[PDB]
Ligand binder design. Sequence first.
Ligand SMILES: [Cl-]
Ligand SMILES: [Cl-]
Ligand SMILES: [Cl-]
Ligand SMILES: [Cl-]
Ligand SMILES: [Cl-]
Ligand SMILES: [Cl-]
Ligand SMILES: [Cl-]
Ligand SMILES: [Cl-]
Ligand code: NA
Length: 129
Amino acid sequence: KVFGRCELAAAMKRHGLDNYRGYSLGNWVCAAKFESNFNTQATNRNTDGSTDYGILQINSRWWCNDGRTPGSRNLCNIPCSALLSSDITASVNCAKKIVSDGNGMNAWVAWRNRCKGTDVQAWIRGCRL
Ligand SMILES: [Cl-]
Ligand SMILES: [Cl-]
Ligand SMILES: [Cl-]
Ligand SMILES: [Cl-]
Ligand SMILES: [Cl-]
Ligand SMILES: [Cl-]
Ligand SMILES: [Cl-]
Ligand SMILES: [Cl-]
Ligand code: NA
């Protein structure tokens, strides 16, 4: 599923991501924009052989199991395939664990490089929430 901007904002808020660990909803929408272009099916291979999955490009190195990332962990206790669902529940639950890990949203390199410090409220501008 490819979400619309306000549609995703609404789903993230419904799943309790809005202001989670102090990160306003626009931060989460901005991160998703640049991680996956709002596409739940997005997958991208990393040079280290791990793969990133879903709207928030959660990495198989630490967070989910894909059965082909040697030496990795599965700290969200989910198959990475669960992170590609049209329903964002698994991605949200796992993102909550990641963002609580110590470095906040800096875990998402695209968030650090493209969203952090910017006018992230623009991402939820005009949305019925
Ligand atoms: Cl957009
Ligand atoms: Cl915001
Ligand atoms: Cl593995
Ligand atoms: Cl493979
Ligand atoms: Cl694990
Ligand atoms: Cl699994
Ligand atoms: Cl959903
Ligand atoms: Cl923080
Ligand atoms: Na893994």
